[PDB]
């Protein structure tokens, strides 16, 4: 909508206080004017037709139970867009400023997030299994770097080239979670995941077998649930990723970490140069190889890191 650009307040899932860009024009929006196209945030009101009507309040105060979710979503796209502009000087996630959409309170009790193809859509959770889940910045994340992967190498969502396309939404959402740098760690989803629980999350990159997920190129799912295990065998790239950046010994074989900047800007040319849809493993091993080589040199310790870590979860 056409308006002035304003500044609201509120606070998100966990009850924090943050600033929101908000537009007015007789209500306040959920539109933030200061980045590219614009972050446009939307109420589903529990229906599944989307994206539902652009978020109006009445005063640009949002500290209502239900503003909740919608403050995350508009926040925590804005930090995932600045992480992409300023870390890697990508606007937005076609790369040309496209506006950011997300619909809060999609369905009822739904226990998921998403990126439909056009935006983002987010649960509130059935209060069992997870809270709103745009009150995790790692999940906002995740599900940005999916529009991001699909205007890039496109991995296919199904088998190996899609369970590379779920790590690599875990390790950019991690990236941006320690961006933000508030209560980061190497999990996935722990902010809004099962409030009964302390502790826990729903994966883990530092150790996916945690949870069940294969950390070894041998233990990999092969039968057909979940796309052929997307989110199950991207556990073996996940740790792969851990490895490159906090270095370790796995099954034997001893990582020196690297550190989670050239980690990131040897994942982000791997995607944006390399892959393809139809990458598998070890196809991105070597779009691993060839970017960390470009960036740092075929005789660097960069280099050789990667390598270590492929070998580490048995992927040649
Ligand atoms: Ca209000
Ligand atoms: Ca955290
Ligand atoms: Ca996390
Ligand atoms: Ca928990």
């Not at 972050?39 to 949002?62: E, H, M």
């Not at 919608?70 to 400023?97: E, F, I, P, Q, W």
């Amino acid at each position: 909508i056409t308006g002035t650009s304003t500044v609201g307040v509120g606070r998100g899932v966990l009850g924090d206080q943050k600033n929101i860009n908000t537009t007015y024009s007789t209500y306040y929006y959920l539109q933030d004017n200061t980045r590219g196209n614009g972050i446009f945030t939307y109420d589903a009101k529990y229906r599944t037709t989307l994206p539902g009507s652009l978020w109006a309040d009445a005063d640009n105060q949002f500290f209502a139970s239900y503003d909740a979710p919608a403050v995350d979503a508009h926040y925590y796209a804005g930090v995932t867009y600045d992480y992409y502009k300023n870390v890697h000087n990508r606007l937005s996630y076609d790369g040309n400023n496209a506006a950011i959409r997300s619909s809060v309170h999609y369905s009822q009790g739904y226990n998921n997030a998403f990126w439909n193809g056009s935006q983002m859509v987010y649960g509130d959770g059935d209060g069992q299994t997870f809270i709103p889940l745009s009150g995790g910045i790692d999940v906002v994340a995740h599900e940005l770097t999916h529009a991001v992967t699909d205007y890039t190498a496109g991995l296919i969502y199904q088998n190996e080239s899609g369970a590379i396309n779920e790590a690599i939404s875990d390790i950019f959402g991690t990236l941006v979670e320690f961006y933000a740098n508030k209560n980061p760690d190497w999990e996935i989803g722990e902010d809004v995941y099962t409030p009964g629980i302390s502790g826990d999350s729903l994966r883990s990159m530092s150790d996916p077998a945690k949870y069940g997920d294969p950390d070894h190129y041998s233990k990999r799912y092969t039968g057909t649930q979940d796309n052929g295990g997307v989110h199950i065998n991207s556990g073996i790239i996940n740790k792969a990723a851990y490895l490159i950046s906090q270095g370790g010994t796995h099954y034997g074989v001893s990582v020196v970490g690297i550190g989670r900047d050239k980690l990131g800007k040897i994942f982000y040319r791997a995607l944006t140069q390399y892959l393809t849809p139809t990458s598998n493993f070890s196809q991105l091993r070597a779009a691993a190889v060839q970017s960390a080589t470009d960036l740092y040199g075929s005789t660097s310790q960069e280099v050789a890191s990667v390598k270590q870590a492929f070998d580490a979860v048995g992927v040649k």
